[PDB]
Write a protein that binds this ligand. Structure first.
Ligand SMILES: CCCCCCCCCCCCCCCCCCCC(=O)O[C@H](COC(=O)CCCCCCCCCCCCCC)COP(=O)(O)OCCN
Ligand SMILES: *[C@@H]1O[C@H](CO)[C@@H](O[C@@H]2O[C@H](CO)[C@@H](O[C@H]3O[C@H](CO)[C@@H](O)[C@H](O)[C@@H]3O)[C@H](O)[C@H]2NC(C)=O)[C@H](O)[C@H]1NC(C)=O
Ligand SMILES: *[C@@H]1O[C@H](CO)[C@@H](O[C@@H]2O[C@H](CO)[C@@H](O)[C@H](O)[C@H]2NC(C)=O)[C@H](O)[C@H]1NC(C)=O
Ligand SMILES: *[C@@H]1O[C@H](CO)[C@@H](O[C@@H]2O[C@H](CO)[C@@H](O)[C@H](O)[C@H]2NC(C)=O)[C@H](O)[C@H]1NC(C)=O
Ligand SMILES: *[C@@H]1O[C@H](CO)[C@@H](O)[C@H](O)[C@H]1NC(C)=O
Lengths: 186, 168
């Protein structure tokens, strides 16, 4: 089992910085997940209207929101690549680190390389197919932002060295924050 | 003559699906598809396509299954679906003997009842049910919103499917 403190942005219209305002200047979700190999009863618990979901429901939400927020952050940070633009940059870097912690806590449910189910460790092609409709829904020109993201993950894997899309995605977002931080000097 | 394709998708919940399908050229059975969402086996019973070409076809079908499941998950997350649930997709291309334009179709049924179907003329999906619902409206909005579910789908039916029939 594990404890995952999730920083969940909204599901409504607004600037990502404004949506995550209290996180940037510091109230989001404490989860508790349980996992077993042959047991199908794998459930997650939301503490503090508190909910009980299946692991698959929680994991789908987590991946879907990671992908939606990445696109939202990237479009906000591309617009300024200004005072809030440096503040947006600092909150994004803080957010990447928060998402890396969330991911490592989720990974504690496994503790095996070959034994991490294909279902939760998809490659770029699979991930981009699986979450096409879910992520695309949110955005105006969603189809194009999704293709842009896939090509950029494909560039990341080509520059580094088949392997998990989430790790390639973390590399892409860590790079955006690096470019972002370096630019805030001038 | 024709290529028909049938896909039955048994959803125990939004996250788990068992696929069972097949395809036929003319009168007889040429392909079989079976397995859970993560490990679906796709086979050509006869060596119609050479190894490289078959691998490409399998890749396209596997991408389709992931996207299909993704759409079902989205409809549930946005509008709520009642599970367990079965979806049937029946699609294909038929080449008239006279020589006119191929007749193409893609019909979707849910729990044995007509739901939505593709209209290739303008590459748009329509409701086949007379029961209006948020679910039907939402599903159609999604299907009619993207190049993938409209134009690429029409090209699969009018071009890929037709060329496959002409070849074998
Ligand atoms: C030359 C070789 C070709 C011949 C192949 C023969 C092999 C037969 C295999 C045997 C098994 C038969 C059953 C499987 C049928 C699948 C049909 C494939 C369709 C497909 O791949 O369409 C692609 C688009 O995908 C999409 O459109 C995905 C979107 C999902 C839409 C789902 C439909 C509606 C469901 C509604 C559910 C909602 C739930 C609410 C209750 C077209 O693209 P492409 O292959 O041309 O490549 C373009 C490269 N970019
Ligand atoms: C597609 O068909 C499915 C069965 O063929 C159907 O599932 C059935 O749904 C009912 C209602 O949700 C379940 O009944 C249970 O829930 C009600 C809730 O009010 C209770 O009162 C009952 O006592 C019962 O516990 C059935 O159990 C379920 N069938 C099976 C075999 O699991 C789907 O709802 C259908 N889906 C669509 C979209 O039409
Ligand atoms: C794919 O699925 C099944 C495999 O047997 C076939 O469905 C049967 O079709 C015949 C008529 O052709 C009916 O008498 C049976 O009742 C059907 N089965 C069921 C369970 O309803 C189907 O023909 C196969 N092939 C194609 C191209 O769909
Ligand atoms: C993944 O690959 C195939 C399914 O795609 C699995 O093999 C299947 O085994 C069951 C039960 O014996 C059969 O109903 C299938 O038709 C078999 N498929 C093939 C291709 O032979 C295989 O066991 C799966 N492995 C894992 C670890 O998930
Ligand atoms: C969709 O296809 C048409 C061609 O029919 C094209 O003009 C358009 O740019 C395509 N791309 C997207 C993402 O809409």
């Amino acid at each position: 089992n594990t404890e995952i403190n999730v920083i969940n942005s909204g599901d409504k219209e607004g600037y990502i910085f404004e949506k995550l305002s209290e996180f940037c200047t510091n109230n989001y979700e404490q989860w508790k997940c349980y996992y077993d190999n042959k047991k199908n009863n794998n459930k997650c618990k939301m503490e503090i209207k508190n909910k009980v979901t299946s692991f698959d429901e929680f994991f789908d939400f987590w991946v879907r929101k990671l992908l939606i927020d990445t696109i939202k952050w990237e479009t906000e940070l591309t617009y300024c690549i200004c005072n809030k633009c440096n503040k947006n940059c600092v909150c994004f870097d803080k957010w990447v680190k928060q998402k890396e912690d969330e991911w490592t806590n989720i990974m504690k449910l496994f503790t095996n390389k070959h034994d991490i189910p294909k279902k939760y460790y998809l490659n770029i092609n699979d991930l981009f197919d699986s979450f096409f409709f879910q992520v695309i829904y949110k955005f105006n020109e969603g189809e194009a932002k999704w293709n842009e993201l896939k090509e950029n993950l494909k560039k990341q894997i080509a520059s580094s060295k088949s392997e998990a899309a989430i790790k390639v995605l973390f590399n892409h977002i860590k790079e955006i924050a690096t470019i972002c931080k370096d630019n805030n000097t001038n | 003559q024709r290529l028909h394709m049938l896909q039955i998708s048994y959803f125990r919940d939004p996250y788990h699906v068992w696929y069972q399908g097949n395809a036929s050229l003319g009168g007889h059975l040429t392909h079989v598809l079976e397995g859970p969402d993560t490990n679906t086996t796709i086979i050509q019973l006869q060596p119609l396509q050479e190894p490289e070409s078959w691998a490409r076809t399998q890749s396209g079908l596997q991408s389709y299954l992931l996207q299909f499941h993704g759409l079902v998950r989205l409809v549930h997350q946005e509008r709520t679906l009642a599970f367990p649930l079965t979806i049937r997709c029946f699609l294909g291309c038929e080449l008239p003997p006279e020589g006119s334009r191929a007749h193409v179709f893609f019909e979707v049924a849910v729990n044995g009842s007509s739901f939505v179907s593709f209209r290739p003329e303008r590459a748009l999906w329509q409701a086949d049910t007379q029961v209006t619902s948020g679910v039907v409206t939402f599903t159609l909005q999604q299907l009619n919103a993207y190049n993938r579910t409209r134009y690429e789908l029409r090209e699969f039916l009018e071009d890929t499917c037709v060329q496959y029939v002409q070849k074998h």
